[PDB]
Amino acid sequence: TLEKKVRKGIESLITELKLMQAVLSKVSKVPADQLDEGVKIWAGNVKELSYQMEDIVDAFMVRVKDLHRISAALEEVVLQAKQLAELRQRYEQEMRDTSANTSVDPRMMALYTDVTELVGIEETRDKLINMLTEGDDWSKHPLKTISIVGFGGLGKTTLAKAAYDKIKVQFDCGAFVSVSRNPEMKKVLKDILYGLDKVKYENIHNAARDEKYLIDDIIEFLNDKRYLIVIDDIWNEKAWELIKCAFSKKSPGSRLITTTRNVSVSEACCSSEDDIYRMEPLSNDVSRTLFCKRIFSQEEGCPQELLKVSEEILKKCGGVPLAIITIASLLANKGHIKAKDEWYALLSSIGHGLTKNRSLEQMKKILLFSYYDLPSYLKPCLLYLSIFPEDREIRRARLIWRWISEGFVYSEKQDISLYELGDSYFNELVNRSMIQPIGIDDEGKVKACRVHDMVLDLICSLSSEENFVTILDDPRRKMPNSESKVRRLSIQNSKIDVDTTRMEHMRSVTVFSDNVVGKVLDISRFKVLRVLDLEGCHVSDVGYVGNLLHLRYLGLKGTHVKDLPMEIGKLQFLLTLDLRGTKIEVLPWSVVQLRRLMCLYVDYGMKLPSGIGNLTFLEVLDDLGLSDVDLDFVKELGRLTKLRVLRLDFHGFDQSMGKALEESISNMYKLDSLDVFVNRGLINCLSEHWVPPPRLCRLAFPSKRSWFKTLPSWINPSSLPLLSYLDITLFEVRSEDIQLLGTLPALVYLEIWNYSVFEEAHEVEAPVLSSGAALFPCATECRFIGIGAVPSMFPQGAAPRLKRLWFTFPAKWISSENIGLGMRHLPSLQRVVVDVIS
Amino acid sequence: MEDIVDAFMVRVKDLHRISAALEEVVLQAKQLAELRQRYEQEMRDTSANTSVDPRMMALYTDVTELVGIEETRDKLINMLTEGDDWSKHPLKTISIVGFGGLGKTTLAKAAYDKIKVQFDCGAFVSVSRNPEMKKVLKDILYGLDKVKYENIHNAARDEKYLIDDIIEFLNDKRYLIVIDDIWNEKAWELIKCAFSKKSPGSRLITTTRNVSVSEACCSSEDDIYRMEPLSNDVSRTLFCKRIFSQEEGCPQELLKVSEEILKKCGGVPLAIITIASLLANKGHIKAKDEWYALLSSIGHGLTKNRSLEQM
Ligand SMILES: Nc1ncnc2c1ncn2[C@@H]1O[C@H](COP(=O)(O)OP(=O)(O)OP(=O)(O)O)[C@@H](O)[C@H]1O
Ligand SMILES: Nc1ncnc2c1ncn2[C@@H]1O[C@H](COP(=O)(O)OP(=O)(O)OP(=O)(O)O)[C@@H](O)[C@H]1O
């Protein structure tokens, strides 16, 4: 009865949501300069109302006393929505004569800069010249493209023009043409035509034929000539392919150049990674020379007392020849306004408030271009990076789980994992040249990520004018004038003002390497809380979570947690549960009560209670402790047919129980990686008659004291052709095992251990790659332990891609003729050191 | 509301139920009324460029790529050029009906490119769904001479005088114009009047997705040119040309998968092109699993993918 009215209101409210995110998505597209401030104010207010409505709908969804509270809340929210409706319309005008001219390109006059000003541009212009002009000799080679990817303002058009200006007189045609974010193909092609001949195509911008006949004209004009066109700032490759068809004829002796901030559109060009040209930030010495060229007259050591400041600030820019230019022009009005005071003020300002200045905003547009080109459902992802401290590394897994728990990832295809979608979001952020990736974790993917400094404080401000995040920093020491409308908090080094009086609807909270937690801060007062992050703290009192219902993320890495409450079953809604580095060594029985989980980063020291097979939705499980286990519990593991990544170590079940689990693995079909740990024994788990899951990529083996008898039969190029990682160890070795392994398609990573060589009195033999010719199309990393891998397995046309190789070499083969090296192989196979054995 | 009105119509106790239903429906109508206005804007500077035609660059494809196009181009040639000898026969049209992307402009261009040097004029002109006759006729004029009619798209005389100009320019010559993608024949009848004079030795070609506008041309079923899906063997050759390097017997275990997929496309040289391009990112991304997934997705969810919506 009453609940029917509530739900019928709720559905209408949700429709109102779709409408309001529609409007907000519409408004946020345009830059915040052409928008009149009335729209700004109205948009801010509707966003604030959007938070409240999302809050109400989430509360109703998690709950179903409460009905009356929900009723009052929804009613009043409708009231102020209705009120805000006409406050807008009450004050508008049209102002037909408001046609203000469109703003010019901020990075246009930057093209008009002095040649004798840039430093260090050399030894890169020459490299890019001879990486494409080496084929200019015998100017009959087929045409090719060389894109240039980068980020921010590291300098792409500058080098493109430099190469364009030098090797130019040896061509019949050419054109330097720019493209904006949302171009008109007719404008672009008119631009190209006017760039070729200005006589016959003088007023080519006037005539408006169509997208076709002008393309036909340009195609006709490009016969029996070498053009060397360059096009820069191409976004959303769908545009480029239209230009691509304009170059569809065979033309020996011509090449073209492209630039963009997305590699993900660059692989669509040149069909080869040998033609992609990454550009790097400048070195420290060149950066210092450039910095001192501007401010100082001729000599830099004259102050001898602001040095520490100088190479402390210059580190923040890193290498981008835009930040250094900006700071050098800003900091010297006329020869050192002053010394060591405003420099330190500037250093403190960056991170929280440096951007708001004069003659500085002319370049922040060049950085917000990339943020504006993002589609929706990705602006929140980029803005989420402001929580973490300035100079720290962010593991991508933490980012993905935080995003999913927040609610920024969702779809309605039902063919997606809800986790590979987060991986897709992360990779889209990466290939847009907005995040630097580092390392490779135990998942076969990127380990962690880092953010550029000026991008960091820029997005910090850009999220700061809204209530998207909130930072408590000593250099900043600022609080918004309204404690009520705070949603996200990123506590940092500051440990003084930890007030929590007026933050009821606190979406999230995190603490970074602080002892202030708990003694000054209370979390239990937060009636709602979406995600909780407390890794690195030194508190073990987390037993108040039973009062929390909306929690999704629960990170407790390195927390000194002795125990966690038995009342955790109330958290029916949950996403992740990380407990690595906790003192608790047994989990409570109230985990069977939980229903929705996909990851469990647990350590094998802890005890897993029986009845684990119920967690069907679980997708990745790490470091499972398999000791003193009954058969039914082991067989439960085959029930949940959704797991993606599993890590196993054990010491106490080496029996036929291994075979019982061994086929129970094959019940799975969603694996990505697997690994097994066991000490000093023959592997009495895997049989030679067991079908593996079709999708397998990593299959590592951490232990080196255990061994297999021989190469398993079920490893074959037939099944599991998706491997990119091998990591095997076994007792014996065969010259035919390598021949078998050379048939698998990818096998990017190779690592093999010969137990008998390093544990028994055996001589390193020389296995022979008998059959085939290459057997290794792409195996960059290959490791052989106790096994002789001479360079002469085959001529250089066997492993095109192999950066590194490791093997053992007897000293008795020095006088032999089986070590016949001396030639250079196809990959960078010149940096090798071998463990020689006497 | 259709439900409510049908219920009332079939029926005439019930009166009160009908009353409540209509009243509440009026209530949701009223509520939804102002939800539209409450969140809406104008954004005068929203002038995004018009979307381009997806099938334009398809016209710009390599000649040495299409297979099996022969023995149909020659057939259409000699079913129109058989009267080209004794080039005094009265002018005639040969329309080309089809559906989907079985390939009509491709064959039209192939015939256009081969038997062309034996004519004084000619023009390949497209028409959209909602054309402007002035635009079409300017297109025709520019395709005849680009010197005297270089900036012919600029001047805006009227639908009359440019028609008179094109009629005048077509004296004592054989033109062989081809016009493709004509829909809603009412557009076509306005153009045929531009070809109203006796011209021995000239013809023209038309294409469309409607036969029902094609009988309006050529006044005879002998001049209608049906075009049909390709044969199984030619389709197999085309399918293996793209994905495979040069030969097909290397897998010897996905063969039956190849035949059971290629049957779904049937014969249309667009579905096979699309699947071949989508299916091999770089040399057989996989083996034997997501082809089964793809086959299963036919019927319910295959269309939602990447680089597929372009067709
Ligand atoms: N060696 C250098 N010395 C001095 N200034 C440099 C140097 N290299 C680049 N710059 C500066 O960097 C900017 C050039 O930017 P860039 O070439 O990357 O432009 P783009 O390709 O249009 O796009 P974006 O800047 O967004 O990457 C200019 O401000 C230029 O003065
Ligand atoms: N023998 C062939 N080999 C390869 N591709 C072909 C072949 N025949 C046709 N195609 C493809 O079919 C498409 C041609 O479409 P078509 O000629 O039917 O266009 P249309 O007349 O403008 O209209 P529609 O496609 O709507 O019927 C192009 O994608 C072309 O590559």
Give the DSSP letter string of A153-182.
Answer: TS-SHHHHHHHHHHTTTT-S--EEEE--SS
CA atoms within 13 A on the CB side of A675: 22
Contact A721 B287 (CB under 8 A): yes
Nearest CA in chain A to B282: A271
Measured from the Cβ of residue A836, the count of other Cβ atoms closer than 10 Å reads: 11
**What is the distance in angstroms between the Cα of A522 and the nearest Cα belonging to chain B?**
39
Q: Give how far the C-alpha of residue B253 lies from the chain's centroid of Cα atoms, to the nearest Å.
A: 37
Question: Ligand 2, residues B60, B72, B105: which to mutate, most atoms within 8 A of Cβ?
Answer: B105
Question: At A621, phi and psi to the nearest 5?
Answer: -130, 135
Point out the ligand nearest to the CA of residue B108. Answer: 2
Documented resolution in Å = 3.3
Contact A210 B139 (CB under 8 A): yes
Report the separation in Å between the CA atom of B106 and the middle of ligand 2, taken as the mean of its atom positions. 6
Contact A34 B43 (CB under 8 A): no
Question: Ligand 1, residues A105, A107, A122, A368: which to mutate, most atoms within 8 A of Cβ?
Answer: A107
Ligand 1 proximity of A257 Cβ (cutoff 6 Å): no
Contacts of B127 (CB under 8 A, 6+ apart): B136, B179, B180, B181, B182, B183, B187
Alpha-carbon separation of residue B75 from A829, B39, B82 (angstroms)? 59, 61, 10
**What is the distance in angstroms between the Cα of A750 and the nearest Cα belonging to chain B?**
20
DSSP state of A707: B
Residue type, A792: S
Ligand 1 proximity of A121 Cβ (cutoff 6 Å): yes
Q: Let me know: does A487 contact A507? Beta carbons within 8 Å.
A: yes
DSSP string, A749-763: EEEEEEHHHHHSS--
| Residues preceding chain discontinuities in chain A with C to N over 2.5 Å | 64
Contacts of B293 (CB under 8 A, 6+ apart): none
Nearest CA in chain B to A22: B39
Report the separation in Å between the CA atom of B226 and the middle of ligand 2, taken as the mean of its atom positions. 15
Where do the H-state alpha helices sit in A651-776? 657-666, 735-741, 755-759
Point out the ligand nearest to the CA of residue B239. Answer: 2
When scoring B53, B60, B109, B132 by the number of chain A Cβ atoms within 10 A, the one with the most, hence best to mutate, is B60
DSSP string, A575-611: ---B-TT-S--S--STTTT----SEEE--TTS-PPS-
Question: At B96, phi and psi to the nearest 5?
Answer: -130, 105
Who among B49, B286, B301 is closest to A184 (CB)? B49
Nearest CA in chain B to A28: B43
Report the separation in Å between the CA atom of A156 and the middle of ligand 1, taken as the mean of its atom positions. 6
Who among B38, B52, B301 is closest to A242 (CB)? B52
Contacts of B49 in chain A (CB under 8 A): 182-185
Q: Let me know: does B172 contact B144? Beta carbons within 8 Å.
A: no
Contact B301 A413 (CB under 8 A): yes
Who among A81, A241, A694 is closest to B57 (CB)? A241
Bridge partners (DSSP) of residue A675 are: A647, A700
Report the separation in Å between the CA atom of A320 and the middle of ligand 1, taken as the mean of its atom positions. 8
Q: Let me know: does A656 contact A629? Beta carbons within 8 Å.
A: no
Who among B38, B62, B289 is closest to A85 (CB)? B38
Mapping DSSP to helix (H, G, I), strand (E, B) and coil, where does residue A700 land? strand
Q: What six digits make up the tokens of A699? A: 């299959």
> What is the bridge-based pairing of β-strands A531-533 and A553-555?
parallel
Contacts of A372 (CB under 8 A, 6+ apart): A29, A31, A181
Please, what is the angle between helix A361-373 and helix A453-464, to 10°? 80
Question: At B17, phi and psi to the nearest 5?
Answer: -60, -45
Point out the ligand nearest to the CA of residue A121. Answer: 1
Closest CA to A749 of A727, A729, A769: A727
Residue type, A610: S
Question: Ligand 2, residues B270, B272, B275, B307: which to mutate, most atoms within 8 A of Cβ?
Answer: B270
When scoring B28, B39, B125 by the number of chain A Cβ atoms within 10 A, the one with the most, hence best to mutate, is B39
Point out the ligand nearest to the CA of residue B241. Answer: 2
Contacts of A333 (CB under 8 A, 6+ apart): none
Contact B39 A27 (CB under 8 A): no
Point out the ligand nearest to the CA of residue A123. Answer: 1
C-alpha torsion angle, residues A695, A696, A697, A700 (rounded to 10): 170
**What is the distance in angstroms between the Cα of B228 and the nearest Cα belonging to chain A?**
28
E-state strands within A378-500: 394-395, 436-440, 446-450, 471-472, 488-491
Distance CA A106, CA A361 (A): 10
Q: Give how far the C-alpha of residue A762 lies from the chain's centroid of Cα atoms, to the nearest Å.
A: 47
Distance CA A155, CA A364 (A): 15
Contact A211 B39 (CB under 8 A): no
Contacts of A327 (CB under 8 A, 6+ apart): A291, A313, A317, A346
Q: Whose CA is nearest to atom 2 of ligand 2?
A: B66
Distance CA A396, CA B225 (A): 60
Q: Let me know: does A493 contact A474? Beta carbons within 8 Å.
A: yes
Q: Let me know: does B76 contact B106? Beta carbons within 8 Å.
A: no
Q: What six digits make up the tokens of A493? A: 């080094």
Q: What six digits make up the tokens of B52? A: 């381009």
**What is the distance in angstroms between the Cα of A184 and the nearest Cα belonging to chain B?**
6
Ligand 1 proximity of A370 Cβ (cutoff 6 Å): no
Q: Which helix (H) or strand (E) holds A229?
A: strand A229-232
Ligand 1 proximity of A118 Cβ (cutoff 6 Å): yes
Where do the H-state alpha helices sit in A90-146? 125-130
Contact B35 A26 (CB under 8 A): no
Contact A722 B286 (CB under 8 A): yes
Question: Annotation-wise, does B104 bind a ligand?
Answer: yes
Q: Give how far the C-alpha of residue A729 lies from the chain's centroid of Cα atoms, to the nearest Å.
A: 33
Nearest CA in chain B to A722: B286
Distance CA A3, CA A8 (A): 9
Who among A85, A206, A213 is closest to B142 (CB)? A213
Contact B35 A15 (CB under 8 A): yes
Measured from the Cβ of residue A518, the count of other Cβ atoms closer than 10 Å reads: 16
Contacts of A101 (CB under 8 A, 6+ apart): none
Distance CA A465, CA A462 (A): 6
Closest CA to A235 of A266, A214, A270, A205: A266
Ligand 2 proximity of B242 Cβ (cutoff 6 Å): no
Measured from the Cβ of residue A771, the count of other Cβ atoms closer than 10 Å reads: 11
**What is the distance in angstroms between the Cα of A666 and the nearest Cα belonging to chain B?**
16
Ligand 2 proximity of B61 Cβ (cutoff 6 Å): yes
Ligand 1 proximity of A422 Cβ (cutoff 6 Å): no
**What is the distance in angstroms between the Cα of B300 and the nearest Cα belonging to chain A?**
11
Placement of tokens 């192989």 in the chain: A825
Atom of ligand 1 nearest to the CA of A121: 1
Ligand 1 proximity of A233 Cβ (cutoff 6 Å): yes
Mapping DSSP to helix (H, G, I), strand (E, B) and coil, where does residue A564 land? coil
Distance CA A165, CA A176 (A): 10
Q: Let me know: does A621 contact A394? Beta carbons within 8 Å.
A: no
Residues belonging to chain A? 838
